[PDB]
Amino acid sequence: NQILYPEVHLDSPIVTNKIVAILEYARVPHAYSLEDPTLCQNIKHRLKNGFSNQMIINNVEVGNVIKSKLRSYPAHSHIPYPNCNQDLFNIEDKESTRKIRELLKKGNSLYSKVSDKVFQCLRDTNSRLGLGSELREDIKEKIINLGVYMHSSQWFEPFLFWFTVKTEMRSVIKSQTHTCHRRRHTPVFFTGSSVELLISRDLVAIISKESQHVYYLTFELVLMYCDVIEGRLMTETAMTIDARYAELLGRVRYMWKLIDGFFPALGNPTYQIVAMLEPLSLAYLQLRDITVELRGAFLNHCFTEIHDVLDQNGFSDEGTYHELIEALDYIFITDDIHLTGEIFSFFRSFGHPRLEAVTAAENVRKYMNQPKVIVYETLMKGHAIFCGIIINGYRDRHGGSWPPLTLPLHAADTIRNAQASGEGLTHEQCVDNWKSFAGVRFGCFMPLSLDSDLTMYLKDKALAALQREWDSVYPKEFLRYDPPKGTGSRRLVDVFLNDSSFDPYDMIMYVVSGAYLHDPEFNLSYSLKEKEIKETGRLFAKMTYKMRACQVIAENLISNGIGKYFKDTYETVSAFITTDLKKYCLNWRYETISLFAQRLNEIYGLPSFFQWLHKRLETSVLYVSDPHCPPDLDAHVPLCKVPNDQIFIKYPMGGIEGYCQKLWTISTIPYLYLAAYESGVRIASLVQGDNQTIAVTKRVPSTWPYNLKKREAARVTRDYFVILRQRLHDIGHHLKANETIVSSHFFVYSKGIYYDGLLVSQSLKSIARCVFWSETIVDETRAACSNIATTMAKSIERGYDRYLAYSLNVLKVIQQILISLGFTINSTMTRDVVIPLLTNNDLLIRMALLPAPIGGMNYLNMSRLFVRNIGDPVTSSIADLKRMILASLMPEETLHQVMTQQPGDSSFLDWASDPYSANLVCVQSITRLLKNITARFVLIHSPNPMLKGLFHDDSKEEDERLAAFLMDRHIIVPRAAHEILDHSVTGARESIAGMLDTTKGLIRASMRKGGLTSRVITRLSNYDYEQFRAGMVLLTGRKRNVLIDKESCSVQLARALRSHMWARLARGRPIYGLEVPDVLESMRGHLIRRHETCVICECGSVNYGWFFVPSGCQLDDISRSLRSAVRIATVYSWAYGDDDSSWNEAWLLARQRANVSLEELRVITPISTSTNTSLVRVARYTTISNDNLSFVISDKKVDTNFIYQQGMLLGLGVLETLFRLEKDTGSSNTVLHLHVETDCCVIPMIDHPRIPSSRKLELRAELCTNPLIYDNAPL
């Protein structure tokens, strides 16, 4: 039970009710002011009655202590969040955080001991690529004094403060909340130089000395402040150490210093000005438009909104507005496009707004109940276009015919002749005489794919208590009456697994029968969302079991059937119209959806099914509930007698976001095409995230002024936008004028904000998220040291500097091991291992520098900086260590130590389920192991009729037996074993078990049930000690290997390593088909300037990649058909390959997969002779040629031994990192040679005919007949 440490990062939405409740229990005076007096008055009346419990008995003492101490500073005051958010970013003290100060100082000294060596190695690596003999000398100083820089920032003191406070709080909570010791003494009000912390079980109290401003916060606020400050520190350091971000540094600094000033005066609404960042960025980017009429278009509305919010908050003056305008001007106006979009990232680095519950429902309640008026003619034209699109969609793939299709009644002879003959038709005839389609009636011709997989239902969600018992989610104290007990669980996966009778065509029939309109239990509820930046913000909805199931089934049907229908001189120009899409789901109506709903009820077979949402909603009341927002009621009444006010939503009509998405998405297009016809221009659409984009095109004469063409595009799109707005207002949806952006150049999407072909990006988005603890159930160093490297590798390719990224990663790893080893809340770290590590130095830094796949604790090898995926994670790290010991960063003993380390104890199955790891003692992932060990039990003990018979008690037995048969031969092959075992039934079980996720709640439930032995609990909680024990023994072991000569190459070294390591199962039999050479070991380069030779190209090397770029001034601007689950059979058969006698076993396992005959399998499989990118700019000016690259080892028609893709990626990487600074491309044109030589990495392969079977094969004696598992009756 003690294996659940508290959370380490913010995940809940801040709510001003929780802190107010805490303090009102504490009886501490405060200054918050709430809209609804419900909570305050309710808790007041309750405490007046006098009820209490252990938690109150606890939280009264803290309040008494605060009351006692307050008398020292008799001129104090509480400063509410975020009105106080200015001081809590500059808060600092030297005394109250002394331990971690010494810790980080020792870490900095450690780093400084080898910074020079790291720089030496990096410079050697760079020079190897021919990028010169020495880097830009303004870099070496930064690389060496990196620690000094990170210490000389302006956020270091607050970072130390909040980190110490957070770790203290976690320690306290994790120690107390476990019922080991029930008796407890209150914490005492600490003292210091300028601050004085009180850390309760749930609240933090800070009291300065000179200012005497008082602060009260909670666990969530502490977490949020820690995250914010850590991100600011990392980002500011990354901008300081680099040079490219010179003026951006000043800009961001001014933005911080300015907006931080409005907080102590404006208040919470400041987050509106904060949320006004992205639109302002887009408008300032628009300011550079080529059609002078568009300049300032969006800017006008942006400034109007800013003036509005100011004049509303109450700054009635005008000079303040003028100065704010000037400040925003200086902030945003720049001259570098690639930096115009960088302010996009910092948009989240100002915190979060404390959002209530009332003012979130007050918005939707008013936007929903409001009348509308539509135009029948326009609606009918839209419906006509829709029917036509469906007609063409079915006419394709069927020889151009309408066989099971509609039947007109009085349509014109013209349109009737199309159906009579068989050709298609366009939007023209439909919009011309829509009167034709007025009265058609389809006939179902599409089947409901129902047994594809089990993903939708298994995606975890929430639920809602039954309609008659809806007051369960509230705790007992926060109401004016005792609530009832909630028996229905709130876990979709548990409720779906513990069932007894389930069949999908029971839910569909439940809807069709109309029972869902009298089901007396269905309910829907709303809950707030976390990490938002608007007081209104958004919400999300949960509902009851049967209705939720019916909804997801319907969505799967529509998205798996008809949904695929809408997937798709003079030249073309195109503008761009961008608009937001939120607050659109609240504007649909039955009157506008019924036509398409009826048409889908026709072409699916189900009667009156695809309009369930409004039909059920119009008689059901909705409300929003959070455990600290209690409805003002006297006693429990049903869901109907509540007055429609202040938390509830009575009788709505508009939909709910997310639900029936595909329906609206496929129903909106006809209006777009209607407007396109009315304007005589073709269009295309896209939805990316939370805003629709439209591209309107137009044809123009070829030879013409480019500016004139781009003016004509805008001229057309203006009229088009006018017409579209008119039509949408006719139908009911009012596309606002301001909130959309017309542009001639750009449009935003997920990866980045595209602009005229070249993509600008926010490199600093990810750096702000590398932290000191990854997110897991038990904080593990092996997890955090990987969560660091992944974000660094991400932030590299978006623009940052490779060398500085590597150095920062090394510093963070050395500074993380120290915290995990000397300052933590774990209880297993005994002095007898804590001391023998911290006392020595070289051992610690060596363990921190050694790569992970060999046994160390570093997770970012050099070859990863350039390429995306490295070849062989063993030989890569061995070559890395070789380069380190060459550059004299590590002693000589380490190589022999790693080559003669002591092996572990692993199974035969994990060797297959992970085919690359030369396995070592205790190098697994605690969370990823606990996931499977807690999944298998629930997945094996559930009687659900969908997964019957798939999980017998002897699962692992057959698993290991099949794995052993597959593996054990006279020559082992892990790759094919992994592939086949994944593509077999065991792989199906594994994929299902992994796809089924887990959480703390499910783990605790399984524990309470007893699916885990105390022995395993001990083995898990005693884990993190073992990696340290093993690293110590590996780094201190004194052995040798006379065969090792460190000039032997990495592959011929890793072979011996693997063999010696796990020889207990190899018995001397070789291991083949696992290793490839490393990229950064056999790839030299050279920079061909205008009038010089090519040394490394003439001394004997002949093969090389050839890159060329000209002096172009730029960087400014310019019997099988439609297969089913059986597809695994063919790929498995090829994986096994052609083996005469073993064809029997191949056919046997394929039959265990599905019902197929040997002849059918043999004819359906193919046969081979073997039984075995738009992230940079300068790329668009190059000319790759692979002329002299044909010289590969043996030059065969086999997979590229070295990866030519990796070669080209490295070439483009160096060619990019050359021109990172200069704007133009220089005077002359540049050529680049990239030679390789891998003669030391050649494998004298001897391809066997095939490993003969060497074991009596054995399977399940009864082929399974479960429907989901591959079809035992396919044809």
Partner: peptide
């Protein structure tokens, strides 16, 4: 027949131009 035809045509043109009004209550 002519007057009947034109009367039917005017009635069809009348019914081809119609608005739809939606309330804001579920069951009044």
């Amino acid at each position: 027949i002519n007057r009947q035809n034109i009367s039917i045509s005017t009635l069809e043109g009348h019914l081809s131009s119609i608005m739809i009004a939606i309330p804001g209550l579920g069951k009044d």
